[PDB]
Amino acid sequence: PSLWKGLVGIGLFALAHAAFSAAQHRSYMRLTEKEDESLPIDIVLQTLLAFAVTCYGIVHIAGEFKDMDATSELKNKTFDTLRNHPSFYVFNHRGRVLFRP
Amino acid sequence: KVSELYDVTWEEMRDKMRKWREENSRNSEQIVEVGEELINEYASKLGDDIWIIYEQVMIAALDYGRDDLALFCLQELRRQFPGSHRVKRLTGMRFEAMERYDDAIQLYDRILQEDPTNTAARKRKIAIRKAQGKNVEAIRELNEYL
Amino acid sequence: RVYPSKQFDVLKDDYDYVLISSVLFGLVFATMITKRLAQVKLLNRAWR
Amino acid sequence: PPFISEAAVRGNAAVLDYCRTSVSALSGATAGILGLTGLYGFIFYLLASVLLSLLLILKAGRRWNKYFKSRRPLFTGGLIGGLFTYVLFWTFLYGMVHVY
Amino acid sequence: PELLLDSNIRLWVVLPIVIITFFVGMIRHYVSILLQSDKKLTQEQVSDSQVLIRSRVLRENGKYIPKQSFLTRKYYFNNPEDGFGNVTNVLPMILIGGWINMTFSGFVTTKVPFPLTLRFKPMLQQGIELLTLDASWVSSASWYFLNVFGLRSIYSLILGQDNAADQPADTNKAFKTEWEALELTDHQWALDDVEEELMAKDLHFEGMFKKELQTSIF
């Protein structure tokens, strides 16, 4: 139902938070002038999890497939609705008499 | 009808009306019942979906022998769209639903004079011919139109 | 202090924030108005 | 099938394009965030693509022959524009984060 | 890395380019929709087009009717009948590019994350005046053009169908062409052995009496 929208929103928010955290960590590291290139593992895990969750959630809202067989939706069509022509309607019948003559 | 023998939202009613529109069903009573409520109690909820519902409900009410709702819908449609050609067709159908054929004929002739490549006016003239039992003339006019 | 290559590293001191904000707001307003006009034109063309 | 309807195939193509574009953009964004660079990062992109295809199978399930003639469009469909969007978002986010 | 950049340039030069190009594309799409065209056709044109479509449909699907009717229609159509706007689409792109080059060029914008060769350098560094700088660093105009080129899929996704971006003659001739094309078509009935195909297996009466008969609306 509508839970997939919440799931994808949560995933996007988590990805944005991970981005902000990585940027802040890089800005702090450039101050201390340390050439160790220390990337925390928790940030990588968080961003990978958020990306996976977001992709899984967004794959379920793109829509639904439909059969390509042209004779698939006419299995339930009946001749009652096929003989009605809206352009040639005429209002001269007993329906007027029955209801408030 | 909501909380009245049924429990459906306005979206469900809109979807049911759309489905009834896709396949040419002619159950006028149910269409009128749903449509009058949708027009009255949920007019503001529908942003731009009320004009096609107006047309459908007007046609159903004309089929149901209830002209007050038809006149109300026709007035609303004419106020919204001034000088349109579909509204003139609806007015002609309302005229011919009351056994006033000369006015409908002159209205359709005026429509054809304003626009020569219009199709609905010819079909309505053929319907007027058919309504009087003149089968041969209707067949000839339909053959010419085809 | 001297800059041989016209100081390609630091933003110029004569940046006009107000003009940027004005042009952004104008773009947004024009987008909204054009969207409304296009929608109304399509609706009116549908109903002849 | 002797008779084919164009509307269904065009709708399926639209759904596939939507999925491909969105997943390519998201993969580019996360690759930029991770700070990967060079051909190494390219590998990630391919991996992401594979993941997408796998999910499509779970979306198609069995009786996939009703929706598509073959799985080849489902696997190798749209690997040109997706790469461009991927590299664009990669550059954008890498400049936004690791630079400055 | 090699260079140290001011965060203010990132905050105030990068995002506005993207916002401007996005909304310019949206405005271009909406304006193009607003004054797309207004075309009118006379009755003879549409009548002849419908006749041509009918003839084409006959040629394509005459294999589903009895041969006598097909040849009766083929006797017809042979004796009696066949024989008796952009300025705003492109110019604003160049104008906006020039305006952006005028009011924004002069500093390093960003860097691509993959190595390149010297061939890339003349394209990505229009504004700067350095000589030995690497080709990965880009100027503002190159970033603007890259952003412009990398939004076709986004426009196709967030907006209906595809827009907001750059990329009969003679009735008698058509009549003669259709007359020549139809003359070499022959009837091939597709119902010769339908009965034998039907008789091969039992009818598929499975999954038809599920659910329940509908009682009322909803």
XYZ file of C-alpha atoms in Angstrom:
613
model
C 0.000 0.000 0.000
C 1.354 3.392 1.098
C 4.151 2.041 3.320
C 6.596 1.925 0.392
C 6.537 5.728 0.166
C 7.509 5.934 3.828
C 10.220 3.322 3.302
C 11.777 5.172 0.361
C 11.576 8.457 2.267
C 13.355 6.904 5.248
C 16.013 5.504 2.924
C 16.588 8.886 1.283
C 16.797 10.579 4.689
C 19.338 8.005 5.888
C 21.414 8.476 2.728
C 21.369 12.255 3.220
C 22.425 11.843 6.856
C 25.288 9.569 5.797
C 26.350 12.149 3.202
C 26.374 14.912 5.816
C 28.335 12.711 8.229
C 30.942 11.861 5.587
C 31.318 15.525 4.628
C 31.715 16.566 8.274
C 34.290 13.826 8.885
C 36.286 14.864 5.810
C 36.192 18.521 6.875
C 37.404 17.607 10.367
C 40.144 15.339 9.001
C 41.524 17.976 6.626
C 42.072 20.233 9.656
C 44.333 17.787 11.516
C 46.355 17.049 8.337
C 46.408 13.266 8.755
C 47.251 11.282 5.615
C 46.018 7.957 7.033
C 42.779 8.090 4.975
C 40.598 6.666 7.751
C 37.073 5.992 6.489
C 34.844 4.734 9.337
C 33.185 1.396 8.623
C 29.850 2.336 10.218
C 29.279 5.096 7.652
C 29.905 2.660 4.788
C 27.527 0.118 6.318
C 24.846 2.768 6.859
C 25.040 4.159 3.326
C 25.060 0.691 1.736
C 22.060 -0.384 3.817
C 20.195 2.822 2.955
C 20.932 2.406 -0.759
C 19.781 -1.225 -0.753
C 16.590 -0.442 1.176
C 15.796 2.535 -1.055
C 16.307 0.551 -4.263
C 14.182 -2.343 -2.983
C 11.416 0.052 -1.957
C 11.497 1.984 -5.225
C 11.393 -1.177 -7.337
C 7.939 -1.907 -5.853
C 6.246 1.399 -6.795
C 7.132 1.764 -10.488
C 3.816 0.133 -11.411
C 2.555 -3.273 -12.488
C 3.032 -5.185 -15.726
C 0.165 -5.989 -18.084
C -0.335 -8.961 -20.378
C 0.542 -8.342 -24.020
C -2.151 -10.735 -25.283
C -4.773 -8.629 -27.057
C -7.554 -11.110 -26.168
C -6.942 -11.046 -22.396
C -9.208 -8.230 -21.161
C -12.156 -9.245 -23.375
C -12.738 -12.552 -21.552
C -15.198 -10.747 -19.249
C -16.691 -8.320 -21.787
C -20.335 -9.069 -22.580
C -22.678 -8.105 -25.397
C -24.844 -6.037 -23.028
C -22.252 -3.242 -22.922
C -21.189 -3.659 -26.567
C -24.564 -2.756 -28.110
C -24.758 0.625 -26.333
C -23.887 3.546 -28.623
C -23.752 6.839 -26.663
C -23.913 8.897 -29.863
C -27.231 7.339 -30.961
C -29.086 7.443 -27.639
C -32.837 8.039 -27.823
C -34.994 8.926 -24.809
C -38.344 7.761 -26.235
C -39.205 4.616 -24.282
C -41.098 3.368 -21.226
C -38.453 4.516 -18.740
C -39.958 8.006 -18.726
C -43.467 6.639 -18.120
C -42.436 4.334 -15.269
C -40.606 7.074 -13.331
C -42.771 10.179 -12.787
C -44.978 10.142 -15.941
C -24.527 6.375 -0.331
C -21.448 6.633 1.880
C -22.356 5.105 5.261
C -25.679 4.308 3.520
C -25.734 0.567 2.712
C -22.088 1.014 1.677
C -18.763 2.175 3.133
C -16.659 3.734 0.365
C -14.466 6.811 0.042
C -14.897 9.494 -2.604
C -11.961 8.002 -4.525
C -13.840 4.701 -4.783
C -16.928 6.483 -6.121
C -14.790 8.354 -8.652
C -13.154 5.107 -9.790
C -16.533 3.373 -10.101
C -17.874 6.272 -12.172
C -14.782 6.159 -14.390
C -15.174 2.404 -14.905
C -18.858 2.876 -15.751
C -17.700 5.508 -18.245
C -15.096 3.287 -19.932
C -17.574 0.510 -20.761
C -20.821 1.905 -22.134
C -23.147 0.831 -19.324
C -26.647 2.318 -19.337
C -27.807 1.693 -15.754
C -29.149 5.213 -15.328
C -30.565 4.800 -11.815
C -27.319 3.846 -10.062
C -25.340 6.411 -12.066
C -27.737 9.172 -10.996
C -27.696 8.000 -7.371
C -23.901 8.099 -7.153
C -23.474 11.214 -9.282
C -25.861 13.526 -7.447
C -24.141 12.741 -4.140
C -20.691 13.191 -5.691
C -21.721 16.575 -7.113
C -23.344 17.767 -3.885
C -21.155 16.578 -1.012
C -17.727 16.404 -2.706
C -17.676 19.241 -5.254
C -14.572 20.945 -3.852
C -12.675 17.676 -3.366
C -12.529 17.024 -7.127
C -10.067 19.552 -8.531
C -10.761 19.170 -12.257
C -12.840 16.021 -12.628
C -16.369 17.396 -12.190
C -17.162 18.402 -15.789
C -17.183 14.893 -17.263
C -19.184 13.768 -14.221
C -21.583 16.647 -14.913
C -22.062 15.472 -18.494
C -22.515 11.824 -17.496
C -24.981 12.644 -14.712
C -26.953 14.952 -17.010
C -27.250 12.204 -19.627
C -28.246 9.633 -16.998
C -30.846 11.976 -15.479
C -32.305 12.625 -18.930
C -32.524 8.849 -19.341
C -34.136 8.576 -15.883
C -36.972 11.068 -16.433
C -35.667 13.601 -13.890
C -35.066 16.974 -15.526
C -34.257 19.237 -12.550
C -30.814 17.676 -12.095
C -30.265 17.789 -15.861
C -31.084 21.506 -15.959
C -28.824 22.175 -12.964
C -25.893 20.336 -14.562
C -26.500 22.042 -17.914
C -26.530 25.462 -16.240
C -23.275 24.707 -14.415
C -21.590 23.452 -17.594
C -22.797 26.429 -19.641
C -21.556 28.845 -16.974
C -18.131 27.187 -16.827
C -17.603 26.932 -20.599
C -19.167 29.838 -22.547
C -19.834 29.206 -26.224
C -18.676 25.585 -26.301
C -20.043 23.064 -28.798
C -20.498 20.074 -26.488
C -22.819 22.165 -24.307
C -24.901 23.003 -27.381
C -25.158 19.283 -28.143
C -26.318 18.637 -24.576
C -28.896 21.422 -24.911
C -30.143 19.888 -28.155
C -30.428 16.481 -26.502
C -32.415 18.048 -23.656
C -34.668 19.764 -26.205
C -35.323 16.530 -28.095
C -35.902 14.616 -24.848
C -39.043 16.758 -24.402
C -40.396 16.051 -27.920
C -39.279 19.437 -29.294
C -37.538 18.407 -32.509
C -37.654 21.587 -34.619
C -35.562 23.540 -32.106
C -32.999 20.731 -31.913
C -32.829 20.568 -35.716
C -32.238 24.314 -36.012
C -29.631 24.165 -33.227
C -27.739 21.354 -34.967
C -27.946 23.189 -38.298
C -26.477 26.266 -36.604
C -23.688 24.122 -35.132
C -22.901 22.639 -38.548
C -22.925 26.111 -40.111
C -20.430 27.370 -37.527
C -18.212 24.286 -37.973
C -18.690 22.126 -41.100
C -16.420 19.236 -40.019
C -18.406 18.349 -36.880
C -19.618 14.778 -36.384
C -21.895 14.731 -33.321
C -24.524 17.015 -34.878
C -25.057 14.623 -37.795
C -25.375 11.681 -35.402
C -27.927 13.586 -33.328
C -29.919 14.433 -36.463
C -29.886 10.732 -37.361
C -31.087 9.954 -33.829
C -33.899 12.495 -34.242
C -34.878 10.779 -37.495
C -34.835 7.397 -35.745
C -36.928 8.626 -32.803
C -39.941 9.250 -35.073
C -39.954 5.755 -36.603
C -38.738 6.949 -40.024
C -36.452 3.980 -40.600
C -35.686 4.403 -44.315
C -34.672 8.059 -43.973
C -32.430 7.201 -41.017
C -30.777 4.390 -42.988
C -30.203 6.690 -45.968
C -28.723 9.460 -43.812
C -26.474 6.991 -41.981
C -25.293 5.608 -45.326
C -24.487 9.140 -46.494
C -22.608 9.899 -43.267
C -20.598 6.676 -43.563
C 49.882 40.235 -1.433
C 49.855 39.436 -5.147
C 47.886 37.059 -7.376
C 49.622 36.345 -10.711
C 46.655 34.339 -12.057
C 43.730 36.558 -10.992
C 42.875 34.519 -7.855
C 40.996 31.555 -9.324
C 40.619 29.955 -5.870
C 38.529 32.386 -3.778
C 35.088 33.753 -4.617
C 35.049 37.373 -5.755
C 34.299 39.981 -3.091
C 31.669 41.708 -5.287
C 29.158 38.839 -5.327
C 25.540 40.038 -5.579
C 23.404 37.732 -3.426
C 20.231 39.769 -3.970
C 20.300 39.354 -7.753
C 20.744 35.581 -7.419
C 17.812 35.321 -5.011
C 15.663 37.511 -7.267
C 16.406 35.486 -10.400
C 15.726 32.201 -8.580
C 12.392 33.485 -7.267
C 11.477 34.792 -10.715
C 12.271 31.428 -12.296
C 10.064 29.644 -9.754
C 7.201 32.103 -10.282
C 7.434 31.785 -14.069
C 7.437 27.987 -13.786
C 4.260 28.034 -11.691
C 2.463 30.502 -13.967
C 3.410 28.648 -17.156
C 2.288 25.330 -15.669
C -1.095 26.812 -14.758
C -1.535 28.391 -18.197
C -0.633 25.162 -20.009
C -3.026 23.114 -17.870
C -5.897 25.545 -18.443
C -5.221 25.639 -22.189
C -5.279 21.838 -22.391
C -8.517 21.691 -20.392
C -10.189 24.323 -22.585
C -9.029 22.627 -25.792
C -10.418 19.292 -24.586
C -13.903 20.793 -24.135
C -13.753 22.681 -27.470
C 0.723 -14.880 -29.206
C -1.018 -14.333 -32.557
C -2.277 -10.862 -31.544
C -0.231 -8.241 -29.687
C -1.382 -4.979 -28.093
C 1.007 -2.031 -28.361
C -0.270 -0.320 -25.201
C 0.891 -3.114 -22.889
C 4.392 -3.301 -24.373
C 4.765 0.492 -24.285
C 3.673 0.543 -20.643
C 6.162 -2.195 -19.780
C 8.916 -0.263 -21.569
C 7.993 2.879 -19.626
C 8.153 0.977 -16.327
C 11.554 -0.482 -17.226
C 12.892 2.956 -18.192
C 11.616 4.450 -14.928
C 13.305 1.723 -12.875
C 16.573 1.947 -14.818
C 16.852 5.736 -14.600
C 16.008 5.878 -10.897
C 18.376 3.066 -9.923
C 21.199 4.544 -12.022
C 20.780 7.943 -10.365
C 20.694 6.411 -6.879
C 23.740 4.226 -7.572
C 25.664 7.249 -8.823
C 24.705 9.187 -5.701
C 25.810 6.438 -3.320
C 29.040 5.825 -5.258
C 29.813 9.526 -4.962
C 29.047 9.430 -1.239
C 31.308 6.423 -0.635
C 34.222 8.378 -2.114
C 35.119 5.675 -4.628
C 37.115 6.906 -7.611
C 38.605 5.523 -10.793
C 37.685 2.346 -12.627
C 37.166 0.707 -9.225
C 33.980 2.733 -8.835
C 32.893 1.582 -12.291
C 32.732 -1.968 -10.929
C 30.195 -0.841 -8.328
C 27.982 0.508 -11.112
C 27.907 -2.865 -12.858
C 27.142 -4.546 -9.540
C 24.256 -2.138 -8.982
C 22.915 -2.901 -12.454
C 22.924 -6.625 -11.702
C 21.014 -6.000 -8.478
C 18.324 -4.117 -10.392
C 17.859 -6.980 -12.835
C 17.543 -9.451 -9.968
C 14.737 -7.437 -8.392
C 12.983 -7.269 -11.759
C 12.848 -11.070 -11.729
C 11.056 -10.970 -8.380
C 8.724 -8.414 -9.946
C 8.129 -10.645 -12.973
C 8.023 -13.903 -11.025
C 6.888 -16.901 -13.034
C 4.797 -16.785 -16.254
C 7.061 -13.958 -17.447
C 6.340 -15.000 -21.046
C 3.005 -13.164 -20.833
C 4.748 -9.821 -20.266
C 7.905 -10.181 -22.389
C 9.185 -12.318 -25.246
C 12.626 -12.838 -23.683
C 14.659 -11.792 -20.653
C 17.326 -10.100 -22.800
C 15.587 -6.676 -22.674
C 15.075 -7.252 -18.941
C 18.844 -7.738 -18.462
C 20.606 -5.540 -21.048
C 17.962 -2.835 -21.433
C 19.119 0.757 -21.170
C 22.844 0.762 -20.369
C 23.676 4.044 -22.133
C 21.768 6.925 -20.564
C 21.954 5.264 -17.162
C 25.746 5.430 -17.332
C 25.595 9.144 -18.185
C 23.294 9.881 -15.248
C 25.506 7.720 -13.018
C 28.690 9.595 -13.923
C 26.949 12.976 -13.637
C 25.635 12.286 -10.132
C 28.971 10.687 -9.210
C 30.873 13.843 -10.155
C 28.297 16.096 -8.487
C 28.313 14.320 -5.126
C 32.063 13.620 -5.108
C 32.692 17.320 -5.675
C 30.110 18.181 -3.029
C 31.605 15.925 -0.342
C 35.259 14.978 -0.740
C 36.351 18.262 -2.336
C 36.206 21.368 -0.106
C 44.093 17.009 -2.510
C 46.255 19.339 -4.602
C 44.176 22.500 -4.161
C 42.401 24.047 -1.182
C 38.997 25.523 -2.020
C 36.719 27.956 -0.205
C 33.483 26.401 1.041
C 31.646 29.600 0.079
C 32.194 28.903 -3.623
C 30.684 25.438 -3.120
C 27.709 26.940 -1.294
C 27.061 29.765 -3.767
C 28.247 28.786 -7.272
C 27.501 25.069 -7.586
C 23.840 24.770 -6.563
C 22.534 27.883 -8.417
C 23.720 26.494 -11.768
C 21.752 23.276 -11.227
C 18.648 25.113 -10.015
C 18.748 27.544 -12.942
C 19.193 24.861 -15.598
C 16.474 22.653 -14.073
C 13.878 25.416 -13.930
C 14.896 26.765 -17.352
C 14.246 23.326 -18.823
C 10.878 23.114 -17.076
C 9.890 26.588 -18.303
C 10.968 25.682 -21.837
C 8.788 22.564 -21.767
C 5.742 24.427 -20.458
C 6.157 27.297 -22.940
C 6.566 24.840 -25.824
C 3.324 23.170 -24.737
C 1.617 26.564 -24.445
C 2.061 27.579 -28.095
C 2.733 24.230 -29.773
C 0.556 24.591 -32.895
C -2.940 25.199 -34.273
C -3.768 23.175 -37.396
C -6.973 22.929 -39.441
C -7.850 20.431 -42.180
C -10.584 20.490 -44.808
C -13.137 17.707 -45.226
C -11.581 16.245 -48.381
C -8.209 15.724 -46.686
C -9.596 13.754 -43.739
C -11.977 11.807 -45.988
C -9.133 10.773 -48.297
C -6.915 9.883 -45.330
C -9.653 7.665 -43.884
C -10.131 6.017 -47.290
C -6.389 5.322 -47.495
C -6.397 3.865 -43.974
C -9.361 1.651 -44.888
C -7.566 0.399 -48.004
C -4.422 -0.327 -45.981
C -6.444 -2.199 -43.349
C -8.130 -4.232 -46.097
C -4.766 -5.153 -47.608
C -3.382 -6.094 -44.192
C -6.337 -8.067 -42.781
C -8.272 -9.489 -45.709
C -7.328 -12.971 -44.454
C -10.142 -13.061 -41.855
C -13.175 -12.810 -44.176
C -14.643 -15.095 -46.854
C -12.752 -14.882 -50.135
C -15.834 -13.748 -52.064
C -16.200 -10.629 -49.908
C -12.463 -9.918 -50.167
C -12.581 -10.057 -53.969
C -15.824 -8.051 -54.029
C -14.028 -5.305 -52.115
C -11.022 -5.825 -54.404
C -13.206 -5.284 -57.473
C -13.967 -2.007 -55.724
C -11.073 0.380 -54.970
C -9.576 -0.511 -58.363
C -12.041 0.537 -61.067
C -14.301 3.193 -59.445
C -12.035 4.633 -56.730
C -8.295 4.419 -57.413
C -8.337 5.808 -60.942
C -11.734 7.518 -60.924
C 7.985 28.293 -32.339
C 11.546 26.994 -32.580
C 13.534 30.130 -31.678
C 12.662 29.646 -28.002
C 13.565 25.954 -28.358
C 17.287 26.507 -29.071
C 18.234 30.189 -28.753
C 17.612 30.399 -24.958
C 20.177 27.620 -24.463
C 22.945 29.676 -26.086
C 21.729 32.889 -24.439
C 21.747 31.340 -20.956
C 25.146 29.774 -21.593
C 26.555 33.154 -22.569
C 24.953 34.893 -19.594
C 26.335 32.266 -17.197
C 29.786 32.580 -18.775
C 29.535 36.350 -18.303
C 28.351 36.401 -14.686
C 29.967 33.239 -13.243
C 33.212 32.306 -15.030
C 36.573 32.709 -13.336
C 37.164 29.978 -10.753
C 37.545 26.226 -10.360
C 34.180 24.513 -9.855
C 34.766 20.786 -9.259
C 36.780 17.738 -10.324
C 35.780 14.484 -12.039
C 36.808 11.327 -10.128
C 38.451 9.510 -13.031
C 41.756 10.231 -14.789
C 41.697 11.844 -18.225
C 44.130 12.828 -20.975
C 45.261 16.187 -22.334
C 42.520 16.013 -24.988
C 39.893 16.741 -22.322
C 41.662 19.848 -20.989
C 40.688 22.403 -23.708
C 36.989 21.586 -23.225
C 36.600 21.632 -19.429
C 38.644 24.772 -18.604
C 37.197 27.517 -20.800
C 37.441 30.276 -18.195
C 40.661 29.643 -16.276
C 44.009 30.892 -17.590
C 46.377 28.325 -16.070
C 48.719 26.212 -18.192
C 49.886 23.104 -16.303
C 46.671 22.399 -14.374
C 45.244 18.896 -14.717
C 42.244 18.232 -16.951
C 40.104 16.817 -14.128
C 39.416 20.285 -12.701
C 36.533 21.975 -14.528
C 35.353 25.548 -15.024
C 31.846 26.939 -14.536
C 30.735 26.885 -18.187
C 31.825 23.265 -18.646
C 29.913 22.336 -15.489
C 26.835 24.141 -16.830
C 27.007 22.304 -20.162
C 27.534 18.973 -18.395
C 24.510 19.639 -16.178
C 22.452 20.574 -19.248
C 23.421 17.385 -21.078
C 22.886 15.139 -18.054
C 19.191 15.763 -17.386
C 17.304 14.156 -20.302
C 16.477 11.017 -18.313
C 15.509 13.060 -15.248
C 13.157 15.184 -17.364
C 11.671 12.044 -18.924
C 11.140 10.562 -15.452
C 9.763 13.485 -13.421
C 7.753 14.845 -16.373
C 5.287 13.226 -18.754
C 6.774 11.497 -21.826
C 9.816 13.342 -23.283
C 10.322 17.072 -23.863
C 12.248 20.116 -22.565
C 15.328 19.349 -24.666
C 16.826 19.573 -28.131
C 17.081 16.568 -30.445
C 0.058 13.498 -47.618
C 2.113 15.241 -50.303
C -0.044 14.485 -53.361
C -3.358 12.635 -53.236
C -2.908 11.212 -56.744
C 0.565 9.876 -55.927
C -0.740 8.122 -52.807
C -3.687 6.728 -54.774
C -1.350 5.310 -57.422
C 1.003 3.884 -54.788
C -1.836 2.119 -52.969
C -3.299 0.884 -56.265
C 0.055 -0.643 -57.219
C 0.616 -2.123 -53.751
C -2.858 -3.686 -53.527
C -2.742 -5.287 -56.988
C -0.208 -7.955 -55.949
C -2.089 -9.127 -52.832
C -4.005 -12.411 -52.904
C -6.468 -13.922 -50.458
C -5.174 -16.555 -48.014
C -7.963 -17.691 -45.695
C -6.937 -18.341 -42.087
C -9.965 -20.501 -41.175
C -9.338 -23.521 -43.422
C -8.387 -25.904 -40.590
C -9.736 -24.168 -37.485
C -11.925 -27.160 -36.583
C -9.009 -29.605 -36.440
C -7.065 -27.204 -34.218
C -10.078 -26.906 -31.902
C -10.605 -30.684 -31.736
C -7.051 -31.360 -30.513
C -7.731 -30.768 -26.812
C -10.546 -30.152 -24.360
C -11.727 -26.618 -23.689
C -10.078 -24.621 -20.900
C -12.921 -24.537 -18.372
C -10.476 -24.047 -15.479
C -10.519 -20.907 -13.354
C -13.896 -19.728 -14.661
C -16.331 -20.631 -11.846
C -14.320 -19.132 -8.984
C -15.452 -16.094 -6.924
C -19.196 -15.412 -6.643
C -21.892 -13.804 -8.772
C -22.072 -10.061 -8.175
C -25.072 -8.873 -6.149
C -25.026 -5.066 -6.416
C -22.677 -2.141 -6.991
C -19.311 -2.044 -5.205
